[PDB]
């Protein structure tokens, strides 16, 4: 669920407020269309697409599905007690959080005008 994804982000990028990732580029955040503006936005585009695929599973709601995971000693691990929905959503959230840690952050790309720039 969203709260868990936020916690993955806090765990993988502890130098920055999780909020920095909540509204960035065309995809990190509310937006989900257009050309990704940079590497970090591409992390978010892949994540968005991953959620759309997981949503095809009956009863699978990626923003709301509570999965089973651990973040300890620098490592994310989606646990074995996850069903197919939980495992898929956890994995989306896992590789996104890892992606964020290696991505440059461009202050210009925070809070951009989706209507104008993401068609």
């Amino acid at each position: 669920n969203l709260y868990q994804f936020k916690n993955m982000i806090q765990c993988t990028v502890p130098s920055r407020s999780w909020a920095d990732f909540a509204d960035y580029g065309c995809y990190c955040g509310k937006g989900g269309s257009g050309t990704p503006v940079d590497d970090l936005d591409r992390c978010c585009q892949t994540h968005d697409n991953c959620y759309n695929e997981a949503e095809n599973i009956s009863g699978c709601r990626p923003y709301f599905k509570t999965y089973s995971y651990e973040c300890t000693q620098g490592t994310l691990t989606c646990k074995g007690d996850n069903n197919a929905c939980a495992a898929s959503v956890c994995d989306c959230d896992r590789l996104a959080a890892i992606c964020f840690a290696g991505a440059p952050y461009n202050d210009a790309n925070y809070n951009i005008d989706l209507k104008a720039r993401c068609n």
Binding site: L2, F5, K6, A22, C28, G29, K30, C44, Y63, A96
Partner: peptide
């Protein structure tokens, strides 16, 4: 991410 919590 997303802050579309509810």
């Amino acid at each position: 991410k997303l802050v579309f919590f509810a």
